[PDB]
Write a protein that binds this ligand. Structure first.
Ligand SMILES: NC(=O)C1=CN([C@@H]2O[C@H](COP(=O)(O)OP(=O)(O)OC[C@H]3O[C@@H](n4cnc5c(N)ncnc54)[C@H](OP(=O)(O)O)[C@@H]3O)[C@@H](O)[C@H]2O)C=CC1
Length: 176
């Protein structure tokens, strides 16, 4: 009922990060005003969900500014991680149907935003639990990197919306 949406910025080579998990390619390229505005998307979200890698990247890179304080956060790991005792975060593991249902509830009928990364998104997809994708594409190939959706087997999707920006950047919504 509440949808698992994977909202993610990707290279033409289908990488969400460079091999050393950097993101210059994106932060160094101006998107343009014509781009669907972040708040318009976030407003449709009452739950974020992610992996151990993406989390450590927000904490190391933005320590005193969590970006999802509005909403409950799920960080996937099989480790013994803790977060700042003020922040709204719950560490889960194992199967993804169970995680999904937990995540959907906490969304309170708004959508669950799979922030990433690939490994994690792949995990949900592998379980048929991932529903739609929102890829902003940057006009560049980095050659090697963090796979956007490393599924075990081929995932058929259905283009639903597609914009091209004046910047050469590109946005598209796809349904599983
Ligand atoms: N817009 C964008 O382009 C975005 C880019 N990124 C980039 O992506 C990078 C990380 O992506 P990526 O490395 O592919 O993967 P993830 O961020 O998903 O992290 C992977 C880790 O998630 C844990 N995990 C995943 N699924 C499960 C499960 N079912 N049960 C238990 N643990 C689980 C494991 O950690 P453990 O060791 O703890 O078991 C696994 O190693 C970030 O570093 C960032 O650079 C990230 C988000 C958005």
């Amino acid at each position: 009922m509440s949808t698992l949406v994977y909202y993610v910025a990707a290279t033409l080579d289908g990488y969400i990060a460079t091999q050393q998990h950097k993101l210059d390619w994106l932060e160094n390229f101006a998107l343009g005003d014509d781009a669907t505005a972040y708040d318009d998307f976030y407003q449709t979200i009452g739950a974020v969900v992610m992996g151990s890698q993406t989390y450590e990247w927000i904490m190391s890179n933005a320590p005193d500014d969590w970006p999802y304080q509005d909403v409950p956060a799920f960080v996937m790991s099989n480790r013994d991680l803790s977060a700042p005792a003020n922040l709204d975060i719950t560490f889960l593991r194992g199967d993804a149907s169970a995680i999904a249902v937990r995540a959907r509830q906490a969304a309170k009928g708004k959508n669950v935003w799979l922030v990433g990364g690939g490994k994690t998104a792949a995990c949900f997809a592998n379980a048929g639990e991932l529903q739609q994708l929102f890829i902003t594409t940057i006009p560049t190939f980095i050659g090697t990197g963090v796979p956007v959706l490393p599924v075990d087997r081929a995932l058929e999707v259905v283009l639903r919306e597609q914009r091209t920006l004046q910047s050469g950047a590109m946005e598209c919504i796809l349904d599983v």
